[PDB]
Amino acid sequence: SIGIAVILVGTSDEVAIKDAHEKDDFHHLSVVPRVELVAMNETDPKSIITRICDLMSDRKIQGVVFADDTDQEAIAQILDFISAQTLTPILGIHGGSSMIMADKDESSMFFQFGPSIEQQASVMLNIMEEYDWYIFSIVTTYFPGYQDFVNKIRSTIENSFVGWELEEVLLLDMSLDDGDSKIQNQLKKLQSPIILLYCTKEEATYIFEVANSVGLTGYGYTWIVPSLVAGDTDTVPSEFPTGLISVSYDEWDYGLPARVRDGIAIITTAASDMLSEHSFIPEPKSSCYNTHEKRIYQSNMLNRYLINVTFEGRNLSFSEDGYQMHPKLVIILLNKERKWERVGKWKDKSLQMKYYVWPRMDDHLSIVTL
Amino acid sequence: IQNQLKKLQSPIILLYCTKEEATYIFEVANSVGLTGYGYTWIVPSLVAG
Amino acid sequence: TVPQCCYGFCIDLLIKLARTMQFTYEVHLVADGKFGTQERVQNSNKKEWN
Amino acid sequence: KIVNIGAVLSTRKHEQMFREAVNQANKRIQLQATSVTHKPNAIQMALSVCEDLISSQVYAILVSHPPTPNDHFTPTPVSYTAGFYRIPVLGLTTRMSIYSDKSIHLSFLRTVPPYSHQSSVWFEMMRVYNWNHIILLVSDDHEGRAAQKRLETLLEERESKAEKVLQFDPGTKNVTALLMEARELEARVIILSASEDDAATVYRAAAMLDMTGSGYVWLVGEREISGNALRYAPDGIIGLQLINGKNESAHISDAVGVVAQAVHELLEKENITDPPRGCVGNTNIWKTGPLFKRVLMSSKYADGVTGRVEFNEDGDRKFAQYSIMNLQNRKLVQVGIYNGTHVIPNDRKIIWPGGETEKPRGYQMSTRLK
């Protein structure tokens, strides 16, 4: 009898997903979930909060599934705020709510499908290990998470038997006005054919313009960037050099055909497991106004039951931080033409490439032996 | 000039230019910074004037 | 922990060292039985000597 | 033009004081006043915040802690609503360390020093007293871990670590094991940093084990002095306190002055775009507000009622003042003032634990080796 709402914003296949929602197989459980398809425009945080409040106060809402289509990142912060102020868990599966926030509050109940930065750093190291690239360098600017990335890459390079070599790690800063001289004097010490870059879109374009003014991006230099530099795979800033390799989430194979269905199934099976084990079902008066008296019920055991679910032969165990920890990552690269062509797929801790040798794009002579 | 002077790796440099050209290349090298501690440059008798 | 008695080169060396340095001591054997090496386990928040 | 000022406090007298302050600031270019009280609930608080931002369209908002003693979750809705549109929000009476991190809050500046920089005062006091050996015993939490990391970095800067580090679970009932382990070391200086509730139990268990005799020096923070912890406190504690901690109007006047200086330095810039008055309408990031925050953080204040106030690149006030309080026979007495970088004592003397009057060695070189 749990209430679950599905909110959509912007342009999307509203009728298609509304028809697909009535295709769940929940006959082997006594859940009878109240489903309410609500569609509107992502106008502002206030309207979103008001709609959430109204739908929750309508009829005993015990869960919220969210999907968006905009590019705003603060919407995830608003969702975290809501899930912190009221103990009803929510799930952001697609849209603006796909921006992963690592520093969440203690009493928050929010889980997304975004991959952790450590997972991306491990994937981009497994790629180098499968490509036999034992020489690399690190360049990054002032950003909330660069230190964590450096610490993770150091922890994963120090605890491995394969001989690697870190050389000339920099901490350049482009925020200083007229700092082109410092950037040019700092980037002049790079001597590795593999570069790891972690910056922002504007900072990435600026450092790429600087490196192209220098010229270490044409033939043999191959740079790798995490999933925050891309932003949108449809547009190209035209400043990114050729032969760029990045990692992203598998959204082209499944935008939202069954993501909402999987989320609803996970919520239902977790509620059923909690009701079976703890012999209790959380269904209080989910009201927005005058909720200070409703702080007698805690959702810690529910969270303890939400991070252990396995359905349809797939691992969905989340982590305490709030990411999936079992995603299906893909490996894309920027070829001659301005585009992102998918090449490899990384799922279930396994790698699956497409080309036996990496395309290099004279002094490249093959050799026949016996 | 900045992309060309970035390949110098010798502690002794031989320079042969004109007074204005010498001042310009010295300003460039000081913007880079290879003239302070260990780099010793030698110039012929036409740079002094 | 059964109380045994030890004797040998290092024993009398430590005796002379404590005599010339004028202090007291309370010896005890090794816990695991190894000189010492790095123990690299996946163990993300763990790295020490054994 | 007509640019109002934003401030959200809960007091009629403080509201009138802020009105007079902004009037005097405008007298020193038309600046209006916009003030909203505090609500018991925070969702309605954020709703009213967006409503007031719609009805006023302010550049930056001021916020202070209400008379409620929590001071933890009160400014979080305001900070979230500010960061949703990338506009700066300044705090007045909030000293939590979670706000110091720029990850959660992209734009947030405080006017009081955090507990992390308070640990540096302990470093200076140990340096001027020649106390190289210390026993850092703190709790296990976000603020505790941040303070411990700051102290460890400031100690390792001088190529010297801590003698021992002990952590206990907050909200516990038995800490005899940690005290027994600490009492078998060579150091005689025990630093403490936790909440007022834990300090009483810590002092009780310490006095129960005769760990408060002569030769031991205790160091705590402002939070471990006030509250009911004062009932269980040995004589000779050297604590700290803020000069304008509970005085809101003193900080409000300086905040009004610095924000007036900021807007006066701002209105003479190009490409000025006022934030949209459409809280419900707009869905993008205002072109102004990030740059305004950047120039406000670097805006060196002229003068204030609390001295020259500066700000580092962390959203925290620098070069503050602390009252070095002490406990002498159940009677609080001041010993000196921390004037930015120098500790100047008064004519009075210090009464160390046990009754002796002499600088303790803080290092007992007992000779019983293993």
Coordinates of C-alpha atoms in Angstrom, one line a residue, chain D residues 33-344:
Chain D
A33 CA 16.0 46.9 3.2
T34 CA 14.4 43.5 3.0
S35 CA 14.1 41.3 6.1
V36 CA 12.2 38.0 6.8
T37 CA 11.8 36.3 10.1
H38 CA 12.5 32.6 10.9
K39 CA 9.9 29.9 10.7
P40 CA 9.9 26.8 13.0
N41 CA 9.8 24.5 9.9
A42 CA 12.5 24.7 7.3
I43 CA 10.5 23.7 4.2
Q44 CA 8.2 26.7 4.6
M45 CA 11.4 28.7 5.5
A46 CA 12.9 27.9 2.1
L47 CA 9.5 28.6 0.4
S48 CA 9.5 32.1 2.0
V49 CA 13.1 32.6 1.1
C50 CA 12.3 32.0 -2.6
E51 CA 9.2 34.2 -2.2
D52 CA 11.3 37.1 -0.7
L53 CA 14.0 36.6 -3.4
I54 CA 11.2 37.0 -6.0
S55 CA 9.7 40.1 -4.4
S56 CA 13.1 41.7 -3.9
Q57 CA 15.7 40.2 -6.3
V58 CA 18.7 40.9 -3.9
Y59 CA 22.3 40.4 -4.9
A60 CA 23.4 38.7 -1.7
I61 CA 21.6 37.5 1.4
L62 CA 22.7 37.7 5.0
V63 CA 21.8 35.1 7.6
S64 CA 22.5 34.6 11.3
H65 CA 21.7 31.8 13.8
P66 CA 18.5 32.1 15.8
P67 CA 18.4 32.0 19.6
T68 CA 17.9 28.2 19.2
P69 CA 21.0 26.4 20.6
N70 CA 21.5 23.9 17.8
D71 CA 22.9 26.3 15.2
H72 CA 23.5 23.3 12.8
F73 CA 20.5 22.9 10.4
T74 CA 19.2 26.5 10.5
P75 CA 21.4 28.0 7.7
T76 CA 21.4 24.9 5.5
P77 CA 18.1 25.7 3.7
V78 CA 19.2 29.3 3.1
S79 CA 22.6 28.1 1.8
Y80 CA 20.9 25.6 -0.5
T81 CA 18.5 28.1 -1.9
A82 CA 21.4 30.5 -2.5
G83 CA 23.6 27.8 -4.2
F84 CA 20.6 26.8 -6.4
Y85 CA 21.1 30.1 -8.3
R86 CA 24.8 30.5 -7.6
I87 CA 24.4 33.6 -5.5
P88 CA 26.4 34.3 -2.3
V89 CA 25.1 33.9 1.2
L90 CA 27.0 35.2 4.3
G91 CA 26.7 33.7 7.7
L92 CA 27.1 35.6 11.0
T93 CA 26.8 33.4 14.0
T94 CA 27.5 29.9 12.6
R95 CA 30.9 28.3 13.3
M96 CA 30.3 24.8 12.1
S97 CA 33.1 23.2 10.0
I98 CA 30.8 21.4 7.4
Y99 CA 30.2 24.8 5.8
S100 CA 34.0 25.4 5.4
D101 CA 34.0 22.7 2.7
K102 CA 33.3 24.3 -0.8
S103 CA 32.0 20.9 -2.1
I104 CA 28.5 21.1 -0.6
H105 CA 28.2 24.9 -0.7
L106 CA 29.6 26.6 -3.7
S107 CA 29.2 30.1 -2.3
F108 CA 29.3 30.7 1.5
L109 CA 31.2 33.1 3.7
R110 CA 31.3 33.2 7.5
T111 CA 32.2 36.0 9.9
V112 CA 33.4 33.8 12.8
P113 CA 36.5 31.6 12.9
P114 CA 35.9 27.8 12.6
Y115 CA 37.1 25.3 15.2
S116 CA 39.7 24.1 12.7
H117 CA 41.7 27.4 13.0
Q118 CA 41.1 27.3 16.7
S119 CA 43.4 24.3 16.8
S120 CA 46.2 26.5 15.5
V121 CA 45.9 28.6 18.7
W122 CA 46.7 25.4 20.6
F123 CA 49.7 24.9 18.3
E124 CA 50.9 28.4 19.1
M125 CA 50.3 28.0 22.8
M126 CA 52.3 24.7 22.8
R127 CA 55.1 26.4 20.8
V128 CA 55.4 29.3 23.1
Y129 CA 55.3 27.0 26.1
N130 CA 57.8 24.5 24.6
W131 CA 55.4 21.5 24.7
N132 CA 56.5 19.1 21.9
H133 CA 54.8 16.1 23.4
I134 CA 51.0 16.1 23.4
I135 CA 48.2 13.5 23.6
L136 CA 45.4 14.4 21.1
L137 CA 42.1 12.8 22.3
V138 CA 39.2 13.8 20.1
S139 CA 35.8 12.3 19.1
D140 CA 34.9 10.6 15.9
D141 CA 32.9 13.0 13.7
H142 CA 33.1 15.4 10.8
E143 CA 34.2 18.4 12.8
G144 CA 36.4 16.3 15.0
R145 CA 38.1 14.6 12.0
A146 CA 38.6 18.0 10.3
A147 CA 40.2 19.5 13.4
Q148 CA 42.4 16.5 13.8
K149 CA 43.5 16.7 10.2
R150 CA 44.2 20.4 10.5
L151 CA 46.3 19.9 13.7
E152 CA 48.2 17.0 12.1
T153 CA 49.0 19.0 9.1
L154 CA 50.1 22.0 11.2
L155 CA 52.3 19.7 13.3
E156 CA 53.8 17.9 10.3
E157 CA 54.7 21.3 8.8
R158 CA 57.4 21.5 11.4
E159 CA 58.4 17.9 10.9
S160 CA 56.9 16.5 14.1
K161 CA 53.9 14.2 14.7
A162 CA 51.7 13.6 17.7
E163 CA 52.7 11.2 20.4
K164 CA 49.4 9.3 20.3
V165 CA 45.9 9.7 18.7
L166 CA 42.8 8.3 20.5
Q167 CA 39.3 8.4 19.1
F168 CA 36.0 7.6 20.9
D169 CA 32.5 7.1 19.7
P170 CA 30.3 10.2 20.4
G171 CA 27.5 9.6 22.8
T172 CA 29.2 6.7 24.6
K173 CA 29.2 5.7 28.3
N174 CA 32.5 4.1 29.0
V175 CA 35.9 5.5 28.0
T176 CA 38.1 3.8 30.7
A177 CA 40.0 1.9 28.1
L178 CA 41.2 5.0 26.3
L179 CA 42.2 6.7 29.5
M180 CA 44.1 3.6 30.7
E181 CA 45.9 3.5 27.4
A182 CA 46.8 7.2 27.6
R183 CA 47.9 7.0 31.2
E184 CA 50.7 4.6 30.1
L185 CA 52.7 7.1 27.9
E186 CA 55.5 9.5 28.4
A187 CA 53.6 12.7 27.6
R188 CA 51.8 14.9 30.1
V189 CA 49.7 17.1 27.8
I190 CA 46.2 16.0 26.9
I191 CA 44.3 18.0 24.3
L192 CA 40.5 17.6 24.1
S193 CA 38.0 18.7 21.5
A194 CA 34.4 17.4 21.6
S195 CA 30.9 18.5 22.6
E196 CA 29.8 19.8 26.0
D197 CA 28.0 16.6 26.8
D198 CA 31.1 14.3 26.3
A199 CA 33.3 16.7 28.3
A200 CA 31.5 16.0 31.6
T201 CA 31.9 12.2 31.2
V202 CA 35.5 12.7 30.1
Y203 CA 36.4 14.8 33.2
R204 CA 34.5 12.4 35.5
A205 CA 36.3 9.3 34.2
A206 CA 39.6 11.2 34.3
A207 CA 39.1 12.3 38.0
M208 CA 38.0 8.7 38.8
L209 CA 41.5 7.5 37.6
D210 CA 43.6 10.2 39.3
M211 CA 44.6 11.5 35.9
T212 CA 44.3 15.2 36.9
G213 CA 47.3 15.5 39.3
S214 CA 50.3 17.8 39.0
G215 CA 52.2 18.0 35.8
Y216 CA 49.2 17.5 33.5
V217 CA 47.9 20.3 31.3
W218 CA 44.5 20.2 29.7
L219 CA 43.4 22.0 26.5
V220 CA 39.8 22.3 25.3
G221 CA 37.7 24.5 23.2
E222 CA 34.9 27.0 23.7
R223 CA 32.2 24.3 23.5
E224 CA 33.9 22.2 26.3
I225 CA 33.7 25.1 28.8
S226 CA 30.1 26.2 28.8
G227 CA 27.1 24.1 29.5
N228 CA 26.7 21.6 32.3
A229 CA 30.3 20.4 31.7
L230 CA 31.4 23.2 34.0
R231 CA 30.2 21.1 37.0
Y232 CA 32.8 18.5 36.2
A233 CA 36.0 20.5 35.4
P234 CA 39.4 20.3 37.2
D235 CA 41.1 23.5 38.2
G236 CA 43.6 24.8 35.7
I237 CA 41.8 24.3 32.4
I238 CA 43.0 26.8 29.7
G239 CA 39.9 27.4 27.5
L240 CA 39.0 29.9 24.8
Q241 CA 36.0 32.0 23.9
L242 CA 34.8 34.5 21.4
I243 CA 34.6 38.2 22.1
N244 CA 31.3 38.8 20.1
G245 CA 29.9 35.3 20.2
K246 CA 26.4 35.9 21.6
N247 CA 26.1 39.6 20.5
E248 CA 24.3 39.5 17.1
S249 CA 24.0 43.3 16.5
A250 CA 27.8 43.8 16.7
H251 CA 28.4 41.4 13.8
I252 CA 25.3 42.6 12.0
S253 CA 26.7 46.2 11.9
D254 CA 30.0 45.0 10.4
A255 CA 28.1 42.8 7.9
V256 CA 26.0 45.7 6.7
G257 CA 29.1 47.8 6.4
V258 CA 31.0 45.3 4.4
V259 CA 28.1 44.5 2.1
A260 CA 27.6 48.2 1.5
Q261 CA 31.2 48.5 0.6
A262 CA 30.9 45.4 -1.7
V263 CA 27.8 46.8 -3.5
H264 CA 29.5 50.2 -3.9
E265 CA 32.5 48.5 -5.5
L266 CA 30.2 46.3 -7.6
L267 CA 27.9 48.8 -9.2
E268 CA 30.9 50.4 -11.0
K269 CA 31.4 47.2 -13.2
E270 CA 30.3 46.2 -16.6
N271 CA 27.9 43.5 -17.8
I272 CA 25.8 43.8 -14.6
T273 CA 22.8 41.5 -14.7
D274 CA 20.4 41.7 -11.7
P275 CA 19.2 38.3 -10.5
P276 CA 15.8 37.4 -11.8
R277 CA 12.8 38.3 -9.7
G278 CA 11.1 35.3 -11.1
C279 CA 11.7 32.7 -8.3
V280 CA 9.0 30.7 -10.0
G281 CA 9.9 31.7 -13.5
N282 CA 13.6 31.6 -14.1
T283 CA 15.4 28.2 -14.4
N284 CA 19.0 29.2 -15.2
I285 CA 22.1 30.6 -13.5
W286 CA 22.4 34.4 -13.1
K287 CA 25.4 35.9 -14.9
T288 CA 26.2 37.9 -11.7
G289 CA 26.6 36.4 -8.3
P290 CA 29.6 34.1 -8.8
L291 CA 31.8 37.0 -9.8
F292 CA 30.2 39.1 -7.0
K293 CA 31.1 36.4 -4.5
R294 CA 34.6 36.2 -5.9
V295 CA 35.1 40.0 -5.5
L296 CA 33.4 40.0 -2.1
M297 CA 35.8 37.2 -0.8
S298 CA 38.7 39.3 -1.9
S299 CA 37.1 42.6 -0.7
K300 CA 39.4 43.7 2.1
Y301 CA 37.1 45.3 4.7
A302 CA 38.1 48.8 5.9
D303 CA 37.2 48.7 9.6
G304 CA 34.6 47.3 11.9
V305 CA 33.4 47.3 15.5
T306 CA 35.2 44.0 15.9
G307 CA 38.5 45.1 14.3
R308 CA 39.8 44.6 10.8
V309 CA 38.0 41.6 9.4
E310 CA 39.6 39.7 6.5
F311 CA 38.7 36.5 4.6
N312 CA 40.7 33.6 3.1
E313 CA 39.7 31.5 0.2
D314 CA 37.6 29.2 2.4
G315 CA 34.6 31.4 3.4
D316 CA 35.9 32.1 6.9
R317 CA 37.0 35.2 8.8
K318 CA 40.7 35.6 9.4
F319 CA 42.7 37.3 12.2
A320 CA 40.0 37.0 14.8
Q321 CA 40.3 37.5 18.6
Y322 CA 39.9 35.0 21.4
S323 CA 39.6 35.4 25.2
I324 CA 42.0 33.0 26.9
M325 CA 39.7 32.0 29.8
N326 CA 40.9 29.9 32.8
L327 CA 39.3 28.2 35.8
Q328 CA 40.8 29.0 39.2
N329 CA 39.1 27.3 42.2
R330 CA 35.6 27.1 40.5
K331 CA 36.0 30.7 39.3
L332 CA 36.5 31.7 35.7
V333 CA 39.2 34.2 35.1
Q334 CA 40.9 35.7 32.0
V335 CA 44.6 35.3 31.5
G336 CA 45.2 37.1 28.2
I337 CA 44.1 37.8 24.7
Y338 CA 45.1 36.1 21.4
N339 CA 46.0 39.1 19.3
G340 CA 46.1 37.4 15.9
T341 CA 49.6 36.0 16.2
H342 CA 50.9 36.9 19.8
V343 CA 49.7 35.7 23.2
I344 CA 50.0 38.5 25.7

